[PDB]
């Protein structure tokens, strides 16, 4: 039983891609660039 070598390799590659995507989902310190404007 267990993973075949191709399954290990594909899981590892997909894992690296997924972790890079997840890291890229983060926000920079300026990311919410808010446009400011008014008129007891």
């Amino acid at each position: 039983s267990g993973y075949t070598p191709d399954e290990k390799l594909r899981l590892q590659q997909l894992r690296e891609l997924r972790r890079r995507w997840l890291k890229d989902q983060e926000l920079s310190p300026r990311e919410p660039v808010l446009p400011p404007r008014r008129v007891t």
Binding site: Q25, E26, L27, P29, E31
Partner: protein, 70 residues
């Protein structure tokens, strides 16, 4: 903790824009209507029922109470 993440969601721009437009136009006509209605009620007042004087026939619009209805 600087762990702020991006929230994937559909565009709310168009729904907000439509709501703002509809609110603006409805208010554009309704605010003058509300102010005028209140002004009419406050100063003009409402007609008070009275007996028809002898020899006088009223107009068809003189049988109604509210000034806007008249």
């Amino acid at each position: 903790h600087g762990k702020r993440l991006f929230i994937i969601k559909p565009s709310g721009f168009y729904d907000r824009r439509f709501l703002k437009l509809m609110r603006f136009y409805i208010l554009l006509t309704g605010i003058p209507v509300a102010i005028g209605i209140t002004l009419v009620n406050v100063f003009i007042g409402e007609a008070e029922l009275a007996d028809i004087p002898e020899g006088y026939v009223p107009e068809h619009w003189e049988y109604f109470k509210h000034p806007i209805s008249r």
